[PDB]
Structure 1
Amino acid sequence: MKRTFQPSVLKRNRSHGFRARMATKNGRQVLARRRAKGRARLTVSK
Structure 2
Amino acid sequence: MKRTFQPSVLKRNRSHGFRARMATKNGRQVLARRRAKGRARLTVSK
TM-score, structure 1 normalization: 0.92
CA drift at 1:2:
1.4
Number of residue equivalences: 46
TM-score, structure 2 normalization: 0.92
CA distance in 1, matches of 2:2, 2:29: 34
CA drift at 1:41:
0.5
Which structure's CA Rg is the greater one?
A: 2
CA RMSD of aligned residues (A): 0.7
CA drift at 1:10:
0.5
CA drift at 1:14:
0.5
Query: For 1:10, what is the secondary structure of its paired residue?
Result: helix
Could you list the per-position Cα deviations for residues 1-46 of structure 1 after superposition, in whole angstroms to 9, with x for gaps in the alignment?
1111110001000000100000000011011101111110100013
In the alignment, what sits opposite 2:10?
A: 10
Matched-pair identity in %: 100
